[PDB]
């Protein structure tokens, strides 16, 4: 699905989901009740690291089991490799290049078939990019400057070291797989990895 | 002189130092001589001495210690048999285990002689794992 | 004898074919002494393994129609 839903709920519960669904911080007129008082079971903590990951990328949870099985299946730090297989997801890159303000914005911006990759169109948000790729607009998007609106309001945050945004010819490419320091979201890999040990 | 001549030496080692006594008297057969030869040179024990009592050549073996502590030896020795009589174990040069990464050794009976994991891993030979200590 | 023949090896609407020299009595997707060849009619290569086709044709396993036609594209036919 998309979850397509009320989302300041998820920001108040999970903590501030960075970039995804807002640059606006939560509870501009809210939070004036509901003392937590400090009781939270540890399973709630690991569950909130699931959904801190799952809402921040908009994944289906069954697909997140799929990415964990591939992450175990690869060789190396599974806590990091999970955040390589979920960074080189395409609409995360179009978010990170500022081609859309939010990640539902990027997912819808790639559903309606506005992205060529290496000159070929990719209609699917779960496309996993590679090193040395090419990410452009559509030919109609020099007449449909929605991407240029997003690139107009974007450039507070610059880019991490895989990206290379070309200003008017609108091309962004990733030099190499993103480093852990490079990952934008702040979370503990071990907490999430431990949670899926049960399966 | 029971069923095993290797649980002889080995159980005399465990029973020796679990009572903190730093002295072993055991028989000196060929394989006991070989084990203490490949065991004094690996830093576990201090000295092995042959002598005779009624012209029966024995090994007295001095264990390691440290200084006056709650117990004068810190690292407990932890000797263990593997290839029991009646259940023989055999390994290739693949299965041959790095005990605790290497902090233990697995003395085993090659066609060369009896080696350790160092001296049977470089050879590429394999054989009957006598016992591993750690 | 043996009859060098294709076998369908792929999904629906795909037609990736192997060239296998199985006995002619078998069903079309069986087992071979040596699975010699490849034929991808959509657009791709065709590995042939010339010495083994010359082994079986040297023995006398006649091929089918379009296997023979693939063998007539390349210059495989030598009578030695």
């Amino acid at each position: 699905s998309r979850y397509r839903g009320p989302r300041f709920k998820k920001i108040r519960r999970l903590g501030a989901l960075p970039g995804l669904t807002n640059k606006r911080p939560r509870a501009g007129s809210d939070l004036r009740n509901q003392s937590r008082s400090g009781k939270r079971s540890q399973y709630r903590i690991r569950l909130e690291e699931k959904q801190k990951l799952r809402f921040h990328y908009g994944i289906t949870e069954r697909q997140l089991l799929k990415y964990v099985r591939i992450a175990r299946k690869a060789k190396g730090s599974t806590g990091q490799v999970l955040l390589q297989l979920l960074e080189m997801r395409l609409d995360n890159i179009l978010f990170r290049l500022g081609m859309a303000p939010t990640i539902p914005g990027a997912r819808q911006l790639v559903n309606h078939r506005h992205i060529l990759v290496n000159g070929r169109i990719v209609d699917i948000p779960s496309y996993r990019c590679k090193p040395q790729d090419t990410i452009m607009a559509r030919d109609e998007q020099k007449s449909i400057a929605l991407i240029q609106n997003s690139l107009d309001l974007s450039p507070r945050e610059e880019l991490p070291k895989h990206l290379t945004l070309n200003p008017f010819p609108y091309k962004g490419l990733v030099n190499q797989i993103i480093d852990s320091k490079w990952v934008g979201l702040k979370i503990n890999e071990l907490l999430v990895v431990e949670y899926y040990s049960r399966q | 002189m029971g069923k095993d001549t290797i649980a002889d030496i080995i159980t005399c080692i465990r029973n020796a130092d679990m009572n903190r006594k730093g002295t072993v008297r055991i028989v000196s057969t060929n394989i006991t001589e070989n084990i203490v030869k490949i065991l004094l040179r690996e830093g576990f024990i201090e000295n092995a001495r042959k002598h005779q009592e009624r012209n029966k050549y024995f090994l007295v073996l001095t264990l390691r210690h440290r200084r006056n502590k709650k117990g004068p030896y810190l690292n407990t020795f932890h000797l263990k048999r593997v290839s029991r009589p009646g259940l023989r174990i055999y390994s290739n040069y693949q299965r041959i285990p790095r005990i605790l990464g290497g902090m233990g050794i697995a003395i085993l009976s090659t066609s060369r002689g009896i080696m350790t994991d160092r001296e049977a891993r470089l050879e590429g030979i394999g054989g009957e794992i006598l016992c591993y200590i750690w | 004898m043996v009859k060098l023949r294709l076998k369908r090896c792929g999904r629906k609407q795909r037609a990736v074919y192997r060239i296998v020299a199985i006995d002619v009595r078998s069903r079309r997707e069986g087992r071979d002494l040596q699975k010699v060849g490849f034929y991808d009619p959509i657009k791709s290569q065709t590995y042939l393994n010339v010495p083994a086709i010359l082994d079986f044709l040297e023995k006398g396993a006649q091929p089918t129609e379009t296997v023979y036609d693939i063998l007539k594209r390349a210059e495989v036919f030598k009578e030695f």
């Binding site: - | 009646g86 259940l87 023989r88 174990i89 | -």
Partner: protein, 78 residues
């Protein structure tokens, strides 16, 4: 393949000897070396084997239902 050496059991049949064959075998789940005996009928036109001698079985053309071997002699390299 190998021959099957083994003791002769009882030769009260013309041209025919029963042979115990002792074979070590690793038991599957538990890792010992269990022996299994299996006794055969071997052929000899010479019938020069008493009770208690030990022969080597080699495959030949089947002579009866059970008699599918003829045993000649071991090598004897001690």
């Amino acid at each position: 393949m190998r021959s099957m050496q083994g003791k002769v059991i009882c030769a009260t049949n013309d041209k025919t000897v029963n042979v115990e064959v002792v074979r070590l075998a690793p038991h599957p789940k538990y890792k010992r070396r269990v022996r299994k005996k299996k006794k055969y009928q071997a052929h000899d036109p010479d019938n020069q084997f008493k009770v208690g001698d030990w022969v080597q079985l080699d495959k030949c053309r089947p002579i009866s239902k059970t008699k599918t071997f003829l045993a000649v002699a071991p090598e004897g390299r001690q």
